[PDB]
Design a protein around this ligand. Structure first.
Ligand SMILES: [Mg+2]
Ligand SMILES: [Mg+2]
Ligand SMILES: [Zn+2]
Ligand SMILES: [Zn+2]
Lengths: 589, 589, 197
DNA sequence: TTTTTTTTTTT
């Protein structure tokens, strides 16, 4: 049999990328610079360089991966001698394997081969340690000898002790020596099939995967991931007598992909358009006709403001939106669109709408009978967007439970001997119906909404949707029929690039307030307070929370255009959208 | 004694079918084409061809079955050698065994004989792996030897390891080698006897069946199946002392039967009649006379519309029907008929059956306390019809969650640290009693069924059934007694032929909306809104959901006649049926 | 059962053709040999005390002269009046109620149609002032019926009326136990104080 | 799961 480590080393250096930049040479440099200890190789670049190298990697994966990794380690050693005695063993990862098998279609013939599975992470256990080379001492007054039990072989998954001391050839008892035992990081996670591939009428299935060494903590629950590795049978309790020769199947993870420079170039190109703000707004729920002002508000909540963390206090940066409208006003349709484009979103309509289900629940751990906290909807949405549907149908005593979360962005529980605090930094978007199902113009605004003023002050923007028959029905009917006919609007930013644009903006753009914006915001707030004092019958309280809503909204407009500071135009836009919200609740200006 | 292998081979190649077409060769070629590895044969054909061969199969299936499989395998590879290196063992399965035993009547004399059982599947375990040929390594410092312990014999259902190393003739410790261990797919299911055959005052019996190799995932739970195989005594733990010399019995499945091109030809022929639409209406619930409008609506519900899946949104294609009938109006007759005629239907009540009433629920594990999901009635009915009798007394928890499932066709969970989304694309047909015993015509519909007005807008059509004590009482009394004696109508379509007709239409007909139908629907919707606007106390809300109902209903009419497009005639019928619905609730259209 | 005591139980074993010869709730006469029961011989340590179980050899549930006697009774033209007069002889009056209770003892004929099923059982509801001998008659009905179950609204649960899940702690297995309504299949279910349930 | 008494959270 011929060798390929020369070709593998040759491929790492002689491969030419998109612009013949030799990224793998650069990738090796990054590995040495940061002591990354792991390298990722695209399969599409292997068969192109040498198709023969591709098959042997796929087929004889067990007996060829250590050979390639050993050759790469020597290549790194000459590139940087100091890499020695820092990372003894190196790993290489292969992605983009053509062998992809659906979870439900896994059979006996698939065990022992390199395969790829796409699914959803649902739970991850904490990082632990696994023994792959143990050291034992023979406790027998003659011996007092120390040795490594698994000779020339990695220690198996089942912990096995020697029965005869190799140093003396006698039985007895042996004591493990933790100080001379080699360990490897170990983690267990469960993957779940996507709902798209689940057959109708069946519950989704799950598979257990094992992450080891640097692969630990590479993903978090609720992430769409693509995993590659080798399947094997699970010997959880081999000592359990009682027949049962039936075994489960678990996966030995070799590489994992979650969810690129070219994306950055595309995103930056979009921001160069002077009307990028208009394009983003037009891309929010293209299938819904009208509701332009509501679409503008939903865009702001997706981007959000800039949270302020000070040495003595913390200031909320998220934006909260409340929508009240008549039935059949596309409230749920627009909300469902948010979960598709938001990098992280949580939906809750009717189940889990109690106080325990929204923030946190104290559940008795049946394993030990004690108590511990279970994360609620708002806690699970931390760092993302929490979507609440049918808020008006929630009980008042249950609804008040989220007042602390909406403003202080924390959840504190003091129940059954547990006192703890959890972070809930999430944006809340809520929808509901008026008090009498449909809006009534005869009644005032206050009783139509039917919400306490305490919770209304926590919402940055509130919109009232009225379904009044008139001359617009013909336009609405034509638009709906055109949608059903397959016609689609053009010049619209699609979904996946919009999601990338929002994700890039949130973690890379931090606008700052200028002196010009300060004067405009201050003047409007003073004017707004005077108008509120004029009419004591208004259902909306103008508190200092409204002033910070203007600051948050203005920052979001700047962040929407990837601008580094808030200018006069951004402040003017924030004031304008505030005027519409005040007018929508009967507060003229 | 006599080698039937030659007889078996010639029987397959010289089987006189319905026209001496040798259908066994046709399926053998099909088996080679797709690598099916499983050939099923009929016991009647074997008996007709050679009754002597049939007796040997039904009497000595333990001995001669592997012999026949070897002969078939040689014939297959001789016919096509490419089958080799892909399948090393073919399977032959017998069906239609005359030895049928009732489940409750099984006794000790039937152990070890080929019998068939009819019942209902209740539980199906996930697919696992079973060891039938293991490889062991002797951990004794002088051996380092590998061997297959079950020498010249398959591994029994009880996992046993060697006591003395065969290669070195010494005892010690042995380690399993998964990489050199043969595995076979293994699944366990439970079959329950039908309620018809259960004796009075007794609980139904159950039987455990084992599915292996390709038989895994051959039947969804809740299906009536016929199972053929061998019975044997279960051995859960042979090492468990404590007397208990009694054992249960389980079944090794060899062939499973659940519950054509000619049908498609007759289905298309049945659609050639221009009066097919009226014929289908008549065929619906032939037992009940009259109620033509209600019969027409139920026919549309079974066919349904065409769902639209877009880039950013999904549009419901199902049709929901609500029936409010007075007591004694026999509202449960066609409901039972609907369940039988529907290709896939679920029958339930308002409260449901399990803890998950209609949508879903989260249940702690009884043994471990872990949280998992239980499918509700709507989820289990995905892709079919959900018949929900007594809708007016659903659980309070489901009164809110049903809003999302009835419109967005999804169930979202964000409780106890679990985030999930389950599809619920199921048409809903529900019946509810009036809240005042007898329906009141002057009162609106919302205060007559005890449901929120928002739910009413989610129903495409609502029908009221009143037991009017008119002249029909004499006819009705005669009609009721005629049903007691027994009577039937003529010139209809049987449920068996109708069921496949609906199934064919739902899988191959996707009507498209034309311009003529588009204009007709637009004018009516505008007219609908104006009439509701004029009346300040309209009993029914006219929302854009009504416009979707017109599109869905019209598409069902085109699908009813297997039309490729929607024409004016389909639109006109859609308008007319909606007009009657508005009259029924008391709206001057 | 003696005064102030709880009913006792005995374990019996049916083998070969004697299996499934009776249903729960039936009154039976059983003949066989008694023997001590051994279940955990390996469980060493005290427990030198054993329980007794019966090895069944024949079982009887609950015939020519009686059939002749029954036929002679039906020959009387006023047999219906005699039967009604024999329902709760210790209660004065309530002739209409007694007549209806006799009908429920016999019942109708069930009919299986093309699609639906027609029950043959008759349901009776009695509303009366306290002290109107409502409970006395129901006790009589539960005693004269060939198969009847007497329940009370306060002393009944949903699990106890239909079916109760019993976890076999020996093997950790779930199996059903027949409830009051199931045990009354083919008979009469008597429920007292239904309004208090 | 099931009946029971108990303190507790949460249906
Ligand atoms: Mg909605
Ligand atoms: Mg009484
Ligand atoms: Zn030693
Ligand atoms: Zn050996």
């Amino acid at each position: 049999q011929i060798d390929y480590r020369d070709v593998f080393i040759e491929f790492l250096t002689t491969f030419k990328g998109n612009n013949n930049q030799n990224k793998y040479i650069e990738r090796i440099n990054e590995l040495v610079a940061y002591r990354k200890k792991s390298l990722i190789i695209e399969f599409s670049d292997v068969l192109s360089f040498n198709e023969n190298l591709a098959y042997e990697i796929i087929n004889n994966t067990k007996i060829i991966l250590p050979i390639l990794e050993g050759a790469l380690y020597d290549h790194i050693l000459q590139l940087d001698p100091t890499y020695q005695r820092d990372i003894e063993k190196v790993h290489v990862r292969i992605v983009g394997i053509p062998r992809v098998i659906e979870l439900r279609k896994i059979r006996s013939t698939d065990i022992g081969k390199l395969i790829t599975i796409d699914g959803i992470l649902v739970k991850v256990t904490p990082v632990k340690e696994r023994i792959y080379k143990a050291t034992y001492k023979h406790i027998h007054p003659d011996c007092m000898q120390e040795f490594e039990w698994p000779e020339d072989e990695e220690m198996p998954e089942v912990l096995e002790m020697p029965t005869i001391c190799p140093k003396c050839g006698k039985p007895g008892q042996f004591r493990l020596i933790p100080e001379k035992t080699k360990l490897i990081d170990w983690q267990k996670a469960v993957i779940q099939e996507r709902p798209e591939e689940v057959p109708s009428g069946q519950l989704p299935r799950q598979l257990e995967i094992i992450l080891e060494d640097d692969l630990v903590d590479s993903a978090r629950p609720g992430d769409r991931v693509k995993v590659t590795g080798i399947l094997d049978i699970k010997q959880d309790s081999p000592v359990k007598r009682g027949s049962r020769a039936v075994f489960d199947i678990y996966m030995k993870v070799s590489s994992i992909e979650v969810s690129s420079e070219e994306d950055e170039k595309k995103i930056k190109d979009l921001a160069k358009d002077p009307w990028i703000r208009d394009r983003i707004i037009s891309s929010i729920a293209p299938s819904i006709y009208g509701h332009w002002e509501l679409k503008e508000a939903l865009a702001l909540a997706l981007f959000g403001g800039v949270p302020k963390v000070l040495e003595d206090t913390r200031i909320r940066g998220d934006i909260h939106i409340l929508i009240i409208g008549d039935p059949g006003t596309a409230k749920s349709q627009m909300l469902q669109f948010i979960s598709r484009v938001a990098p992280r979103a949580v939906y809750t309509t009717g189940k889990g709408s109690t106080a325990a289900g929204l923030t946190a629940a104290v559940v008795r751990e049946k394993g030990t009978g004690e108590y511990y906290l279970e994360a609620g909807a708002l806690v699970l949405a931390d760092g993302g967007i929490a979507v609440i549907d049918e808020i008006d149908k929630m009980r008042d005593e249950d609804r008040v439970a989220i007042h602390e979360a909406m403003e202080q962005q924390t959840v504190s529980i003091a129940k059954a001997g547990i006192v703890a605090k959890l972070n809930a930094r999430a944006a809340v978007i809520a929808a509901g119906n008026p008090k009498f199902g449909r809006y009534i113009s005869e009644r005032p605004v206050s009783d139509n909404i039917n919400l306490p003023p305490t919770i209304l002050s926590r919402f940055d923007l509130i919109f009232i949707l009225k379904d009044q028959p008139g001359e617009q029905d013909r336009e609405l009917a034509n638009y709906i029929l055109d949608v059903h006919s397959g016609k689609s609007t053009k010049n619209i930013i699609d979904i996946d690039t919009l999601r990338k644009y929002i994700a890039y903006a949130r973690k890379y753009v931090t606008p700052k307030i200028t002196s010009e914006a300060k004067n405009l915001i201050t003047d409007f707030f003073v004017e707004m307070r005077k108008k509120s004092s004029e009419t004591p019958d208004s259902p909306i309280l103008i508190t200092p929370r409204q002033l910070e809503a203007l600051i948050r909204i203005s920052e979001a407009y700047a962040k929407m255009a990837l601008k580094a500071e808030v200018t006069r135009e951004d402040a003017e836009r924030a004031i304008n959208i505030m005027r519409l919200f005040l007018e929508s609740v009967g507060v003229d200006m």
